[PDB]
Write a protein that binds this ligand. Structure first.
Ligand SMILES: *Cc1ccc(-c2ccc(C)cn2)nc1
Ligand SMILES: [Ca+2]
Length: 269
């Protein structure tokens, strides 16, 4: 039996699916701890930039969880992603510890721009800027990648890098009441929000687990971007980002929420 995590319903992905929009033909890179083989995921390819972890399999869990929110398969098992037919790529930039470097992350972004990715999900960040990372965000953007990044979990009224950069789409987290999750960073540069509390997704060991974080919000938006791209194949990264923002539901505060709650039904109408 398959069940639909609450956040998938909250972003109105099933309405898009009913219109035949699933993310088919859209390439989405998950720049994370890897993605493990799982019966509810279809991993097309990828690369590792973590020395000593030459495989793209996930030794942490976080990247597999993020991947399932984007693209868990629509079938009779497990869960269901926002964009269940997205073409998923495992771009390992963080090790099994959950840590990486700005160089590794930059290499993953360069890979995304050299391999035709439409969307890159970066459920990662840090309070400090990085020239290395910024250059790579800008380069990937110039190659047509929509970079979607988590605002961070410190609870502060400023957001992490790379989400803070103009060429990243910064995603904060909401709860079941459509309030900002207490940990979700907000403020200048925040673009949009999505569910990030009690998010069930795929997890290594061929199982499922629930997590909290702006890391869980981000892939809802990455998946929504893939739905928009399937509907509008000619559109650029900027056009997709703008349309997601323009069709988001206001949550009553730009400071806190950016454009508001992503809405895949309104974005694919
Ligand atoms: C510091 C830290 C620890 C754990 C995580 C995490 C693990 C697993 C899942 C599903 C979500 N988040 N993030 C940051
Ligand atoms: Ca499934």
């Amino acid at each position: 039996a398959q069940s639909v995590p609450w956040g998938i319903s909250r972003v109105q992905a099933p309405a898009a699916h009913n219109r035949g929009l699933t993310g088919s033909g859209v390439k989405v890179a998950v720049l994370d701890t890897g993605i493990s083989t799982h019966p509810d995921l279809n991993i097309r390819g990828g690369a590792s930039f973590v020395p000593g972890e030459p495989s793209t399999q996930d030794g942490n869990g976080h990247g597999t969880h993020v991947a399932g929110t984007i693209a868990a398969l629509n079938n009779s098992i497990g869960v269901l992603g926002v964009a269940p037919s997205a073409e998923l790529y495992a771009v390992k930039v963080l090790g099994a510890s959950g840590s990486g470097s700005v160089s590794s992350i930059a290499q993953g972004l360069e890979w995304a721009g050299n391999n035709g990715m439409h969307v890159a999900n970066l459920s990662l960040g840090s309070p400090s800027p990085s020239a290395t990372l910024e250059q790579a965000v800008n380069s990937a953007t110039s190659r047509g990648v929509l970079v979607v990044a988590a605002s961070g979990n410190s609870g502060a009224g400023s957001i992490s890098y790379p989400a803070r950069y103009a060429n990243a789409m910064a995603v904060g987290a909401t709860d079941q009441n459509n309030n900002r999750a207490s940990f979700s960073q907000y403020g200048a540069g925040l673009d949009i929000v999505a569910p990030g509390v009690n998010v069930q997704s795929t997890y290594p060991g061929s199982t499922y687990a629930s997590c909290n974080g702006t890391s869980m919000a981000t892939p809802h938006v990455a998946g929504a971007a893939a739905l928009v791209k399937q509907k509008n194949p000619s559109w650029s990264n900027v056009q997709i980002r703008n349309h997601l923002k323009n069709t988001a539901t206001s949550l009553g505060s730009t400071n806190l929420y950016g454009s508001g709650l992503v809405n895949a039904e309104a974005a694919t109408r």
